[PDB]
Protein backbone atom coordinates (compact mmCIF):
# COMPACT_ATOMS: atom_id res chain seq x y z
CA UNK A 1 0.00 0.00 0.00
CA UNK A 2 1.98 2.97 1.33
CA UNK A 3 2.44 2.51 5.07
CA UNK A 4 3.02 -0.50 7.37
CA UNK A 5 3.62 -3.90 5.75
CA UNK A 6 2.57 -7.49 6.44
CA UNK A 7 4.31 -10.71 5.40
CA UNK A 8 2.31 -13.88 6.08
CA UNK A 9 4.84 -16.63 6.77
CA UNK A 10 2.40 -19.31 7.92
CA UNK A 11 -1.39 -19.45 7.82
CA UNK A 12 -4.04 -21.89 9.01
CA UNK A 13 -7.48 -22.09 10.61
CA UNK A 14 -6.12 -21.66 14.14
CA UNK A 15 -2.86 -19.74 13.66
CA UNK A 16 -1.31 -16.88 11.68
CA UNK A 17 2.46 -16.38 11.70
CA UNK A 18 3.36 -13.06 10.08
CA UNK A 19 5.84 -10.18 10.06
CA UNK A 20 4.77 -6.61 10.83
CA UNK A 21 7.05 -4.21 8.96
CA UNK A 22 7.36 -0.41 9.13
CA UNK A 23 5.56 0.12 12.43
CA UNK A 24 6.14 1.78 15.80
CA UNK A 25 6.57 -0.44 18.86
CA UNK A 26 3.61 1.11 20.67
CA UNK A 27 1.27 0.34 17.77
CA UNK A 28 2.30 -3.32 17.65
CA UNK A 29 1.92 -3.58 21.42
CA UNK A 30 -1.47 -1.86 21.37
CA UNK A 31 -2.59 -4.13 18.53
CA UNK A 32 -1.59 -7.10 20.68
CA UNK A 33 -3.48 -5.74 23.70
CA UNK A 34 -6.62 -5.11 21.65
CA UNK A 35 -6.38 -8.57 20.10
CA UNK A 36 -6.19 -10.01 23.62
CA UNK A 37 -8.91 -8.08 25.45
CA UNK A 38 -10.91 -5.54 23.46
CA UNK A 39 -12.67 -7.73 20.89
CA UNK A 40 -16.43 -8.44 21.22
CA UNK A 41 -17.42 -12.10 21.54
CA UNK A 42 -20.55 -14.12 22.32
CA UNK A 43 -20.36 -16.23 25.48
CA UNK A 44 -22.70 -17.55 28.18
CA UNK A 45 -23.42 -14.86 30.77
CA UNK A 46 -26.62 -16.16 32.35
CA UNK A 47 -27.35 -19.69 33.57
CA UNK A 48 -30.79 -20.80 34.78
CA UNK A 49 -30.64 -24.20 36.48
CA UNK A 50 -33.87 -26.20 36.77
CA UNK A 51 -32.71 -29.63 37.94
CA UNK A 52 -29.14 -30.51 38.90
CA UNK A 53 -28.44 -33.93 40.40
CA UNK A 54 -24.92 -34.19 38.99
CA UNK A 55 -21.74 -34.31 41.07
CA UNK A 56 -20.58 -30.81 40.14
CA UNK A 57 -22.03 -27.72 41.82
CA UNK A 58 -24.38 -25.31 40.05
CA UNK A 59 -22.06 -22.34 39.54
CA UNK A 60 -19.24 -24.83 39.02
CA UNK A 61 -21.05 -25.91 35.87
CA UNK A 62 -22.11 -22.35 35.05
CA UNK A 63 -18.45 -21.31 35.07
CA UNK A 64 -17.26 -23.80 32.44
CA UNK A 65 -20.47 -23.04 30.54
CA UNK A 66 -19.29 -19.44 30.40
CA UNK A 67 -15.94 -20.59 29.03
CA UNK A 68 -17.53 -22.52 26.16
CA UNK A 69 -16.42 -21.06 22.80
CA UNK A 70 -19.47 -19.89 20.84
CA UNK A 71 -19.78 -18.70 17.24
CA UNK A 72 -19.07 -14.97 17.12
CA UNK A 73 -18.92 -14.31 13.38
CA UNK A 74 -21.87 -11.94 13.01
CA UNK A 75 -21.38 -10.71 16.58
CA UNK A 76 -21.07 -7.20 15.14
CA UNK A 77 -24.72 -7.26 14.05
CA UNK A 78 -25.64 -8.45 17.52
CA UNK A 79 -26.03 -5.89 20.31
CA UNK A 80 -25.07 -5.40 23.95
CA UNK A 81 -27.84 -6.26 26.41
CA UNK A 82 -26.97 -3.03 28.22
CA UNK A 83 -27.66 -1.06 25.04
CA UNK A 84 -30.83 -2.79 23.84
CA UNK A 85 -34.15 -1.21 24.85
CA UNK A 86 -35.54 -4.59 25.93
CA UNK A 87 -36.28 -5.98 29.38
CA UNK A 88 -33.38 -8.18 30.51
CA UNK A 89 -32.56 -9.81 27.16
CA UNK A 90 -34.06 -10.51 23.73
CA UNK A 91 -33.22 -11.84 20.26
CA UNK A 92 -31.53 -8.62 19.17
CA UNK A 93 -28.98 -8.77 21.99
CA UNK A 94 -28.71 -12.30 23.37
CA UNK A 95 -28.74 -15.92 22.21
CA UNK A 96 -30.61 -18.48 24.30
CA UNK A 97 -29.58 -22.14 24.14
CA UNK A 98 -30.82 -25.00 26.31
CA UNK A 99 -29.16 -28.06 27.84
CA UNK A 100 -31.02 -31.23 28.79
CA UNK A 101 -28.97 -34.26 29.84
CA UNK A 102 -29.87 -37.43 31.73
CA UNK A 103 -28.09 -40.65 32.68
CA UNK A 104 -29.40 -43.39 30.42
CA UNK A 105 -26.95 -46.29 30.21
CA UNK A 106 -25.23 -48.12 33.07
CA UNK A 107 -21.98 -46.58 31.86
CA UNK A 108 -21.04 -42.95 32.50
CA UNK A 109 -23.05 -40.57 30.32
CA UNK A 110 -20.82 -37.69 29.21
CA UNK A 111 -22.25 -34.21 28.66
CA UNK A 112 -20.42 -32.27 25.95
CA UNK A 113 -20.86 -28.86 24.32
CA UNK A 114 -22.56 -30.43 21.30
CA UNK A 115 -25.55 -31.17 23.53
CA UNK A 116 -26.23 -27.43 23.70
CA UNK A 117 -29.27 -26.63 21.56
CA UNK A 118 -30.03 -23.12 20.30
CA UNK A 119 -33.57 -22.02 21.20
CA UNK A 120 -33.69 -18.28 20.46
CA UNK A 121 -34.26 -16.88 16.97
CA UNK A 122 -30.95 -16.23 15.20
CA UNK A 123 -32.82 -14.56 12.31
CA UNK A 124 -30.07 -15.15 9.76
CA UNK A 125 -27.03 -14.15 11.82
CA UNK A 126 -24.29 -16.78 12.08
CA UNK A 127 -24.04 -16.88 15.86
CA UNK A 128 -24.46 -18.94 19.02
CA UNK A 129 -23.19 -22.22 17.59
CA UNK A 130 -20.66 -23.82 19.97
CA UNK A 131 -17.27 -24.32 18.28
CA UNK A 132 -16.35 -27.98 17.89
CA UNK A 133 -12.74 -28.52 16.82
CA UNK A 134 -12.97 -31.98 18.36
CA UNK A 135 -12.05 -34.88 16.07
CA UNK A 136 -14.98 -37.09 17.10
CA UNK A 137 -17.17 -33.99 16.98
CA UNK A 138 -18.10 -33.83 20.66
CA UNK A 139 -16.56 -30.56 21.79
CA UNK A 140 -15.80 -29.42 25.33
CA UNK A 141 -16.53 -32.06 27.97
CA UNK A 142 -18.89 -30.17 30.28
CA UNK A 143 -20.02 -32.80 32.77
CA UNK A 144 -20.52 -36.48 33.58
CA UNK A 145 -23.70 -38.26 34.69
CA UNK A 146 -24.04 -41.57 36.52
CA UNK A 147 -27.14 -43.74 36.08
CA UNK A 148 -30.09 -41.64 37.22
CA UNK A 149 -28.45 -38.22 37.40
CA UNK A 150 -30.10 -35.37 35.50
CA UNK A 151 -28.91 -31.92 34.41
CA UNK A 152 -31.48 -29.51 33.00
CA UNK A 153 -30.64 -25.84 32.45
CA UNK A 154 -30.87 -22.86 30.10
CA UNK A 155 -28.11 -20.51 28.93
CA UNK A 156 -28.45 -16.87 27.92
CA UNK A 157 -25.34 -15.79 26.02
CA UNK A 158 -24.59 -12.09 25.64
CA UNK A 159 -22.09 -9.93 23.75
CA UNK A 160 -19.07 -9.19 25.92
CA UNK A 161 -15.48 -7.97 26.00
CA UNK A 162 -12.55 -10.05 27.25
CA UNK A 163 -11.60 -6.99 29.29
CA UNK A 164 -14.69 -7.69 31.40
CA UNK A 165 -14.10 -11.44 31.60
CA UNK A 166 -11.53 -13.78 30.04
CA UNK A 167 -14.33 -16.01 28.73
CA UNK A 168 -14.90 -13.43 25.99
CA UNK A 169 -11.31 -13.91 24.83
CA UNK A 170 -11.21 -14.39 21.04
CA UNK A 171 -7.51 -15.25 21.00
CA UNK A 172 -5.30 -17.50 23.13
CA UNK A 173 -1.56 -16.86 23.07
CA UNK A 174 -0.04 -14.18 20.85
CA UNK A 175 3.62 -14.73 20.00
CA UNK A 176 5.57 -11.48 19.80
CA UNK A 177 9.27 -10.85 19.17
CA UNK A 178 11.34 -7.97 17.79
CA UNK A 179 15.08 -7.79 17.02
CA UNK A 180 16.20 -11.43 17.47
CA UNK A 181 19.86 -10.36 17.59
CA UNK A 182 19.55 -7.76 20.36
CA UNK A 183 21.00 -5.15 18.00
CA UNK A 184 18.89 -2.49 19.71
CA UNK A 185 20.32 -3.71 23.03
CA UNK A 186 16.96 -3.54 24.80
CA UNK A 187 18.10 -6.53 26.85
CA UNK A 188 21.25 -7.10 28.89
CA UNK A 189 21.73 -10.87 28.72
CA UNK A 190 22.48 -12.94 31.82
CA UNK A 191 25.31 -15.48 31.70
CA UNK A 192 27.92 -17.50 33.60
CA UNK A 193 30.52 -17.84 30.86
CA UNK A 194 29.55 -17.33 27.22
CA UNK A 195 26.44 -15.24 26.54
CA UNK A 196 25.73 -16.67 23.09
CA UNK A 197 26.32 -20.38 23.75
CA UNK A 198 24.02 -20.40 26.78
CA UNK A 199 21.08 -18.43 25.39
CA UNK A 200 19.22 -20.34 22.63
CA UNK A 201 18.89 -18.94 19.11
CA UNK A 202 15.50 -17.68 17.91
CA UNK A 203 13.89 -18.91 14.68
CA UNK A 204 13.33 -15.32 13.56
CA UNK A 205 17.13 -15.01 13.38
CA UNK A 206 16.77 -16.63 9.96
CA UNK A 207 15.00 -13.48 8.78
CA UNK A 208 17.58 -10.87 9.80
CA UNK A 209 21.27 -10.10 9.30
CA UNK A 210 23.72 -10.95 12.13
CA UNK A 211 25.84 -8.08 13.54
CA UNK A 212 29.51 -7.61 12.67
CA UNK A 213 32.05 -7.26 15.48
CA UNK A 214 33.90 -4.75 13.32
CA UNK A 215 30.79 -2.58 13.38
CA UNK A 216 30.07 -0.25 16.33
CA UNK A 217 26.71 0.11 18.09
CA UNK A 218 23.90 1.51 15.94
CA UNK A 219 22.46 4.05 18.37
CA UNK A 220 20.11 5.72 15.89
CA UNK A 221 18.14 2.54 15.19
CA UNK A 222 14.55 1.90 16.29
CA UNK A 223 12.14 -1.04 16.12
CA UNK A 224 10.60 -1.72 12.70
CA UNK A 225 10.45 -5.48 12.15
CA UNK A 226 8.12 -7.44 14.43
CA UNK A 227 7.46 -11.18 14.38
CA UNK A 228 3.97 -12.21 15.47
CA UNK A 229 1.93 -15.39 15.72
CA UNK A 230 -1.76 -14.99 16.51
CA UNK A 231 -3.73 -18.03 17.69
CA UNK A 232 -7.53 -18.15 17.70
CA UNK A 233 -9.83 -20.20 19.93
CA UNK A 234 -12.55 -20.74 17.33
CA UNK A 235 -15.13 -18.06 18.06
CA UNK A 236 -13.47 -15.75 15.54
CA UNK A 237 -11.15 -16.73 12.64
CA UNK A 238 -7.52 -15.58 13.01
CA UNK A 239 -7.61 -13.13 10.11
CA UNK A 240 -10.82 -11.70 11.56
CA UNK A 241 -9.20 -11.67 15.00
CA UNK A 242 -6.38 -9.40 13.90
CA UNK A 243 -8.61 -7.40 11.53
CA UNK A 244 -11.32 -6.73 14.11
CA UNK A 245 -8.48 -5.93 16.49
CA UNK A 246 -7.18 -3.26 14.12
CA UNK A 247 -10.69 -1.93 13.49
CA UNK A 248 -11.37 -1.85 17.23
CA UNK A 249 -8.22 0.15 17.93
CA UNK A 250 -9.02 2.49 15.03
CA UNK A 251 -12.60 2.88 16.26
CA UNK A 252 -11.65 3.66 19.86
CA UNK A 253 -9.17 6.22 18.54
CA UNK A 254 -11.95 7.67 16.38
CA UNK A 255 -14.07 7.94 19.53
CA UNK A 256 -11.39 10.10 21.14
CA UNK A 257 -11.22 12.19 17.97
CA UNK A 258 -15.01 12.47 18.07
CA UNK A 259 -14.79 13.52 21.72
CA UNK A 260 -12.39 16.28 20.70
CA UNK A 261 -14.93 17.28 18.05
CA UNK A 262 -17.65 17.37 20.71
CA UNK A 263 -15.75 19.41 23.31
CA UNK A 264 -15.91 22.43 21.00
CA UNK A 265 -19.54 22.92 22.02
CA UNK A 266 -20.41 26.06 24.00
CA UNK B 1 -12.90 -32.67 39.75
CA UNK B 2 -13.12 -32.67 35.95
CA UNK B 3 -10.86 -31.47 33.12
CA UNK B 4 -10.68 -27.65 33.03
CA UNK B 5 -12.43 -26.26 29.95
CA UNK B 6 -9.70 -23.75 29.06
CA UNK B 7 -6.06 -23.21 30.05
CA UNK B 8 -5.62 -20.67 32.85
CA UNK B 9 -2.47 -18.98 31.53
CA UNK B 10 -3.12 -18.32 27.83
CA UNK B 11 -6.73 -19.36 27.26
CA UNK B 12 -6.53 -22.29 24.85
CA UNK B 13 -9.40 -24.78 24.93
CA UNK B 14 -8.21 -28.01 26.55
CA UNK B 15 -11.48 -29.47 27.81
CA UNK B 16 -12.18 -31.22 24.51
CA UNK B 17 -8.76 -32.87 24.57
CA UNK B 18 -9.08 -34.97 27.73
CA UNK B 19 -10.60 -38.23 26.49
CA UNK B 20 -8.42 -38.17 23.37
CA UNK B 21 -5.36 -37.74 25.60
CA UNK B 22 -6.35 -40.82 27.59
CA UNK B 23 -6.72 -42.78 24.36
CA UNK B 24 -3.28 -41.66 23.22
CA UNK B 25 -1.97 -43.17 26.45
CA UNK B 26 -3.79 -46.50 26.40
CA UNK B 27 -4.80 -47.15 22.79
CA UNK B 28 -1.61 -46.10 21.02
CA UNK B 29 0.54 -46.82 24.08
CA UNK B 30 2.42 -43.52 23.93
CA UNK B 31 4.12 -41.55 26.70
CA UNK B 32 2.52 -38.42 28.16
CA UNK B 33 4.84 -36.03 26.31
CA UNK B 34 4.12 -37.27 22.79
CA UNK B 35 0.41 -37.55 23.57
CA UNK B 36 0.37 -33.93 24.73
CA UNK B 37 2.37 -32.94 21.65
CA UNK B 38 -0.03 -34.60 19.21
CA UNK B 39 -3.01 -32.77 20.71
CA UNK B 40 -1.50 -29.42 19.74
CA UNK B 41 -0.30 -28.50 23.22
CA UNK B 42 3.07 -26.93 22.42
CA UNK B 43 3.15 -24.33 25.22
CA UNK B 44 3.97 -25.92 28.57
CA UNK B 45 1.17 -24.05 30.33
CA UNK B 46 -1.57 -25.95 28.49
CA UNK B 47 0.66 -29.01 28.47
CA UNK B 48 0.69 -28.57 32.24
CA UNK B 49 -3.07 -27.97 32.27
CA UNK B 50 -3.67 -31.46 30.90
CA UNK B 51 -0.69 -33.37 32.32
CA UNK B 52 -1.07 -31.96 35.84
CA UNK B 53 -4.84 -32.50 36.06
CA UNK B 54 -6.45 -35.27 38.10
CA UNK B 55 -9.90 -36.51 37.08
CA UNK B 56 -11.69 -36.82 40.42
CA UNK B 57 -15.23 -36.87 39.04
CA UNK B 58 -14.88 -40.58 38.25
CA UNK B 59 -14.48 -41.31 41.95
CA UNK B 60 -17.36 -38.93 42.64
CA UNK B 61 -19.72 -40.86 40.37
CA UNK B 62 -19.18 -43.94 42.54
CA UNK B 63 -21.92 -42.77 44.92
CA UNK B 64 -25.61 -43.58 44.41
CA UNK B 65 -27.54 -40.48 45.69
CA UNK C 1 -44.02 -29.96 51.57
CA UNK C 2 -42.03 -32.95 50.30
CA UNK C 3 -38.72 -34.64 51.12
CA UNK C 4 -36.41 -37.29 49.66
CA UNK C 5 -34.59 -40.13 51.42
CA UNK C 6 -30.80 -40.44 51.58
CA UNK C 7 -29.76 -44.03 50.88
CA UNK C 8 -32.63 -44.73 48.47
CA UNK C 9 -34.31 -43.03 45.52
CA UNK C 10 -37.75 -42.09 46.85
CA UNK C 11 -40.08 -39.08 46.96
CA UNK C 12 -41.91 -38.69 50.27
CA UNK C 13 -44.39 -35.83 50.72
CA UNK C 14 -44.96 -36.19 54.46
CA UNK C 15 -45.33 -32.72 55.97
CA UNK C 16 -45.32 -31.89 59.68
CA UNK C 17 -46.55 -34.28 62.41
CA UNK C 18 -44.96 -37.14 60.46
CA UNK C 19 -41.19 -36.81 59.97
CA UNK C 20 -39.19 -40.04 60.24
CA UNK C 21 -38.91 -42.50 58.79
CA UNK C 22 -39.03 -43.38 55.09
CA UNK C 23 -41.42 -45.25 52.79
CA UNK C 24 -40.23 -48.86 52.36
CA UNK C 25 -36.68 -48.32 53.64
CA UNK C 26 -36.07 -48.22 57.38
CA UNK C 27 -33.65 -45.32 57.78
CA UNK C 28 -34.43 -41.89 59.19
CA UNK C 29 -32.04 -39.71 57.18
CA UNK C 30 -34.26 -37.33 55.18
CA UNK C 31 -33.11 -34.55 52.84
CA UNK C 32 -35.24 -31.66 51.59
CA UNK C 33 -36.07 -31.31 47.89
CA UNK C 34 -34.89 -28.49 45.62
CA UNK C 35 -36.93 -25.29 45.29
CA UNK C 36 -39.16 -24.70 42.26
CA UNK C 37 -38.23 -21.02 42.05
CA UNK C 38 -35.16 -21.07 39.82
CA UNK C 39 -31.98 -19.13 40.56
CA UNK C 40 -29.74 -17.54 37.95
CA UNK C 41 -25.96 -17.85 37.74
CA UNK C 42 -23.66 -15.26 36.20
CA UNK C 43 -21.49 -17.60 34.13
CA UNK C 44 -18.23 -16.02 35.31
CA UNK D 1 -17.08 -7.94 48.58
CA UNK D 2 -15.41 -4.58 48.00
CA UNK D 3 -14.30 -5.44 44.47
CA UNK D 4 -15.56 -2.92 41.87
CA UNK D 5 -17.61 -3.85 38.81
CA UNK D 6 -15.65 -5.03 35.78
CA UNK D 7 -17.52 -2.87 33.28
CA UNK D 8 -16.18 0.14 35.19
CA UNK D 9 -13.01 -0.45 33.16
CA UNK D 10 -14.63 0.62 29.87
CA UNK D 11 -18.10 1.96 30.74
CA UNK D 12 -18.23 5.64 31.68
CA UNK D 13 -19.88 6.40 35.02
CA UNK D 14 -22.51 8.98 35.95
CA UNK D 15 -21.35 12.37 34.71
CA UNK D 16 -17.83 11.20 33.88
CA UNK D 17 -16.77 12.71 30.55
CA UNK D 18 -14.41 10.86 28.20
CA UNK D 19 -11.76 13.58 28.05
CA UNK D 20 -10.85 16.28 30.57
CA UNK D 21 -8.75 19.09 29.10
CA UNK D 22 -6.96 21.10 31.80
CA UNK D 23 -4.64 24.13 31.41
CA UNK D 24 -1.21 23.15 32.75
CA UNK D 25 -0.06 25.81 35.21
CA UNK D 26 3.59 24.74 35.16
CA UNK D 27 5.05 25.51 31.73
CA UNK D 28 3.28 27.88 29.30
CA UNK D 29 1.48 26.49 26.23
CA UNK D 30 1.00 23.12 27.94
CA UNK D 31 -2.03 20.96 28.73
CA UNK D 32 -3.02 17.89 30.75
CA UNK D 33 -5.80 15.70 29.34
CA UNK D 34 -7.53 13.10 31.50
CA UNK D 35 -8.60 9.99 29.59
CA UNK D 36 -11.35 8.04 31.35
CA UNK D 37 -12.05 4.32 30.90
CA UNK D 38 -8.79 3.78 29.00
CA UNK D 39 -5.43 2.13 29.75
CA UNK D 40 -1.90 1.82 28.35
CA UNK D 41 -3.28 0.49 25.05
CA UNK D 42 -4.38 3.95 23.94
CA UNK D 43 -2.03 6.10 26.02
CA UNK D 44 1.26 4.56 24.92
CA UNK D 45 0.21 4.70 21.26
CA UNK D 46 -0.99 8.31 21.34
CA UNK D 47 2.10 9.40 23.29
CA UNK D 48 4.40 7.59 20.87
CA UNK D 49 2.62 9.25 17.95
CA UNK D 50 2.86 12.68 19.58
CA UNK D 51 6.66 12.43 19.51
CA UNK D 52 6.69 11.99 15.74
CA UNK D 53 5.33 15.53 15.42
CA UNK D 54 8.43 17.72 15.43
CA UNK D 55 6.40 20.73 16.57
CA UNK D 56 5.74 19.03 19.91
CA UNK D 57 8.09 19.87 22.79
CA UNK D 58 6.66 17.49 25.39
CA UNK D 59 4.36 14.47 25.41
CA UNK D 60 3.95 11.96 28.25
CA UNK D 61 1.20 9.72 29.62
CA UNK D 62 0.78 8.04 33.01
CA UNK D 63 -1.64 5.81 34.92
CA UNK D 64 -1.78 7.19 38.46
CA UNK D 65 -3.31 3.98 39.85
CA UNK D 66 -3.95 0.51 38.33
CA UNK D 67 -7.16 0.18 40.37
CA UNK D 68 -8.82 2.83 38.23
CA UNK D 69 -9.04 2.65 34.44
CA UNK D 70 -7.83 6.12 33.49
CA UNK D 71 -4.65 7.95 32.47
CA UNK D 72 -3.35 11.51 32.18
CA UNK D 73 -1.61 12.80 29.05
CA UNK D 74 0.50 15.97 29.20
CA UNK D 75 1.27 17.75 25.93
CA UNK D 76 3.40 20.84 25.30
CA UNK D 77 3.73 22.33 21.81
CA UNK D 78 5.49 25.29 20.20
CA UNK D 79 3.85 28.72 20.21
CA UNK D 80 1.33 29.15 17.40
CA UNK D 81 0.32 25.50 17.69
CA UNK D 82 -2.67 24.45 19.80
CA UNK D 83 -1.94 21.05 21.44
CA UNK D 84 -5.46 19.79 20.66
CA UNK D 85 -4.52 19.97 16.98
CA UNK D 86 -1.42 17.91 17.76
CA UNK D 87 -3.63 15.32 19.43
CA UNK D 88 -5.97 15.36 16.43
CA UNK D 89 -3.12 14.95 13.95
CA UNK D 90 -1.68 12.12 16.02
CA UNK D 91 -5.05 10.37 16.19
CA UNK D 92 -5.73 10.73 12.46
CA UNK D 93 -2.21 9.47 11.73
CA UNK D 94 -2.89 6.42 13.89
CA UNK D 95 -6.22 5.78 12.15
CA UNK D 96 -4.63 6.06 8.70
CA UNK D 97 -1.74 3.74 9.55
CA UNK D 98 -4.18 1.22 11.04
CA UNK D 99 -6.43 1.34 7.98
CA UNK D 100 -3.48 0.87 5.64
CA UNK D 101 -2.32 -2.00 7.85
CA UNK D 102 -5.75 -3.62 7.62
CA UNK D 103 -5.84 -3.30 3.83
CA UNK D 104 -2.31 -4.71 3.56
CA UNK D 105 -3.10 -7.65 5.83
CA UNK D 106 -6.26 -8.40 3.85
CA UNK D 107 -4.46 -8.34 0.50
CA UNK D 108 -1.72 -10.52 2.00
CA UNK D 109 -4.29 -12.92 3.46
CA UNK D 110 -6.09 -13.37 0.14
CA UNK D 111 -2.90 -14.93 -1.23
CA UNK D 112 -2.54 -17.76 1.30
CA UNK D 113 -3.53 -21.42 1.57
CA UNK D 114 -4.66 -23.79 4.35
ZN1 LIG E 1 -32.22 -6.94 23.84
ZN1 LIG F 1 -1.77 -22.19 28.03
ZN1 LIG G 1 -35.72 -44.83 52.14
Curated annotation (Swiss-Prot), chain A:
GO molecular function: DNA binding; DNA-directed RNA polymerase activity; metal ion binding; protein dimerization activity
Keywords, alphabetical: Acetylation, DNA-directed RNA polymerase, Metal-binding, Nucleus, Transcription, Zinc
Main location, first listed in the record: nucleus
Keyword Nucleus in record: yes
Compartment(s) where it occurs, according to its Swiss-Prot or TrEMBL record: Nucleus
GO biological process terms held by the UniProt record: RNA-templated transcription; termination of RNA polymerase II transcription; transcription by RNA polymerase II; transcription elongation by RNA polymerase II; transcription initiation at RNA polymerase II promoter
Domain of life: Eukaryota
Outcome following mutation: residue 28 to D: In mutant RPB3-1
Disulfide bond positions: none
A Gene Ontology term for the protein's cellular component: nucleoplasm
Annotated binding of Zn(2+), by residue: 84, 86, 90, 93
The family this protein is said to belong to: Belongs to the archaeal Rpo3/eukaryotic RPB3 RNA polymerase subunit family.
Purpose of the protein: DNA-dependent RNA polymerase catalyzes the transcription of DNA into RNA using the four ribonucleoside triphosphates as substrates. Component of RNA polymerase II which synthesizes mRNA precursors and many functional non-coding RNAs. Pol II is the central component of the basal RNA polymerase II transcription machinery. It is composed of mobile elements that move relative to each other. RPB3 is part of the core element with the central large cleft and the clamp element that moves to open and close the cleft. Seems to be involved in transcription termination.
Description of how the protein assembles with itself and partners: Component of the RNA polymerase II (Pol II) complex consisting of 12 subunits.
Note from the entry: Present with 10000 molecules/cell in log phase SD medium.
From Swiss-Prot, chain B:
This protein's UniProt keywords: DNA-directed RNA polymerase, Isopeptide bond, Metal-binding, Nucleus, Ribosome biogenesis, Transcription, Ubl conjugation, Zinc
Protein name: DNA-directed RNA polymerases I, II, and III subunit RPABC5
Gene Ontology CC annotation, any one: RNA polymerase III complex
Quaternary organization: Component of the RNA polymerase I (Pol I), RNA polymerase II (Pol II) and RNA polymerase III (Pol III) complexes. Component of the RNA polymerase I (Pol I) complex consisting of 14 subunits: RPA135, RPA190, RPC40, RPA14, RPB5, RPO26, RPA43, RPB8, RPA12, RPB10, RPC19, RPC10, RPA49 and RPA34. The complex is composed of a horseshoe-shaped core containing ten subunits (RPA135, RPA190, RPB5, RPO26, RPB8, RPB10, RPC10, RPA12, RPC19 and RPC40) where RPA135 and RPA190 form the DNA-binding cleft.
Source species of the chain: Saccharomyces cerevisiae (strain ATCC 204508 / S288c) (Baker's yeast)
Database matches in InterPro entries: RNA_pol_su_RPB10, RNA_pol_suN_Zn-BS, RPABC5/Rpb10
Subcellular compartments: Nucleus, Nucleolus
Main location: nucleus
UniProt-listed Gene3D superfamilies: Homeodomain-like (1.10.10.60)
Cross-link (Glycyl lysine isopeptide (Lys-Gly) (interchain with G-Cter in ubiquitin)): 59
Positions that bind Zn(2+): 7, 10, 45-46
Coiled-coil zones: none
GO biological process, one term: tRNA transcription by RNA polymerase III
Family per record: Belongs to the archaeal Rpo10/eukaryotic RPB10 RNA polymerase subunit family.
Gene Ontology MF terms in the entry: DNA binding; DNA-directed RNA polymerase activity; zinc ion binding
UniProt xrefs under HAMAP family: RNApol_arch_Rpo10 (MF_00250)
Additional facts recorded: Present with 5300 molecules/cell in log phase SD medium.
Swiss-Prot record, chain C:
Cystine pairs: none
Residue ranges of the TM segments: none
GO biological process, one term: transcription elongation by RNA polymerase I
UniProt PTM comment: The N-terminus is blocked.
Binding of Zn(2+), residues: 5, 8, 22, 25
Complexes and interactors: Component of the RNA polymerase I (Pol I), RNA polymerase II (Pol II) and RNA polymerase III (Pol III) complexes. Component of the RNA polymerase I (Pol I) complex consisting of 14 subunits: RPA135, RPA190, RPC40, RPA14, RPB5, RPO26, RPA43, RPB8, RPA12, RPB10, RPC19, RPC10, RPA49 and RPA34. The complex is composed of a horseshoe-shaped core containing ten subunits (RPA135, RPA190, RPB5, RPO26, RPB8, RPB10, RPC10, RPA12, RPC19 and RPC40) where RPA135 and RPA190 form the DNA-binding cleft.
Protein task: DNA-dependent RNA polymerases catalyze the transcription of DNA into RNA using the four ribonucleoside triphosphates as substrates. Common component of RNA polymerases I, II and III which synthesize ribosomal RNA precursors, mRNA precursors and many functional non-coding RNAs, and a small RNAs, such as 5S rRNA and tRNAs, respectively. RNA polymerases are composed of mobile elements that move relative to each other. In Pol II, the core element with the central large cleft comprises RPB3, RBP10, RPB11, RPB12 and regions of RPB1 and RPB2 forming the active center.
UniProt record similarity statement: Belongs to the archaeal Rpo12/eukaryotic RPC10 RNA polymerase subunit family.
From Swiss-Prot, chain D:
Gene Ontology BP, a term: transcription initiation at RNA polymerase II promoter
Pfam family membership, one: RNA_pol_L_2
Subcellular location: Nucleus
Protein keywords: DNA-directed RNA polymerase, Nucleus, Transcription
Effect of substituting residue 108 to K: Transcript termination readthrough. Lethal
InterPro entries reported in the protein's UniProt record: RBP11, RBP11-like, RBP11-like_dimer, RNA_pol_Rpb11_13-16kDa_CS, Rpo11-like
GO function terms (MF aspect): DNA binding; DNA-directed RNA polymerase activity; protein dimerization activity
GO cellular component: a single term: RNA polymerase II, core complex
Major site of localization recorded for this protein: nucleus
Protein name as it appears in the record: DNA-directed RNA polymerase II subunit RPB11
Highest classification ranks of the organism: Eukaryota, Fungi, Dikarya, Ascomycota, Saccharomycotina
